[PDB]
Subunit: 169 residues, 2 copies
């Protein structure tokens, strides 16, 4: 099945659906992200990983790695934090900037797979702005749709470089 | 048309097949084309819209995020778009809720929602923006919806449409 959620004006249901997806995950949580600076969502990851048994693997677009490391450093994330967490860098195809410098195309895909049961996917980025001021769309997917997301994750994973945490999913 | 069909969903991943789907969706629209967009600077996509609008009977309404009207306008001016181009095209401005920047200045939240409704038959939604970069270097996702699901996009459009300001072109439905 497939469901689509639109942001309500009064309250941010989009954020809540993401946080609920993470806080309710039992065993496995794989995430494809472009930007990750929102401390709170990472706290929901830490909780699932260290307070529950959840194995977390975050494929982050190479562009956001820097500000993500700054987030971690700010709240003093440790290797011990990441006993069950794996953050890997991933990047799009190589191209020439106008300066002649070679850059990596941005991974704009964003989705969350919980317990290999259902998938969340939409425009919501793990930033404070997305979860407070921006109007996003969000889609939920179950059944056969989850597989095409799985193969996407595996595909991207193979091309991914390790950044921090578990170096062996 | 969607109102008669059962609900369905399909997801597309990058192989540029995503752009093709987007363009193919526009070039195969027959009567009506509703679009919600955040950034519109790709002349080629706007040219596909001109074709559908003026060479076919297609009425095109585009809800563009206020934060992108500027560069959309520069695009039009660059290729010298006139009022005559837009006899059947309606570009309107829509903006998110109001909030305070750190500078104290009030700004409108961005509508990061991006979708296209073609002939009230099927919806394309995803990360693909109408910019050159998206169509050439970025990796996007694109989902297609048909049937009863489309209604939630229709209602979402109408909600946003009621909020929109006229910017350019035909000021009507």
């Amino acid at each position: 099945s497939a469901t689509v959620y639109f942001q309500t004006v009064k309250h941010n249901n989009i954020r809540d659906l993401v946080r609920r997806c993470i806080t309710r995950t039992s065993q496995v949580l794989v995430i494809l992200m472009d930007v990750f600076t929102d401390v709170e969502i990472f706290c929901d990851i830490l909780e699932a990983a260290n307070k529950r048994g959840v194995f977390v693997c975050v494929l982050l677009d190479q562009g956001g790695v820097k500000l993500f490391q700054e987030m971690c450093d700010k709240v003093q994330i440790s290797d011990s934090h990441l006993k069950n967490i794996s953050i890997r860098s991933v990047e799009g195809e190589i191209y020439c900037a106008k300066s002649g410098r070679k850059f990596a195309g941005q991974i704009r895909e964003k989705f969350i797979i919980s317990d290999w049961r259902f998938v969340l996917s939409g425009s919501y980025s793990f930033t404070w702005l997305c979860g407070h001021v921006h109007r996003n769309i969000l889609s939920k997917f179950t059944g056969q749709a989850v597989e095409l997301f799985d193969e996407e994750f595996r595909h991207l994973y193979a091309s991914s470089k390790p950044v921090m945490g578990l170096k062996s999913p």
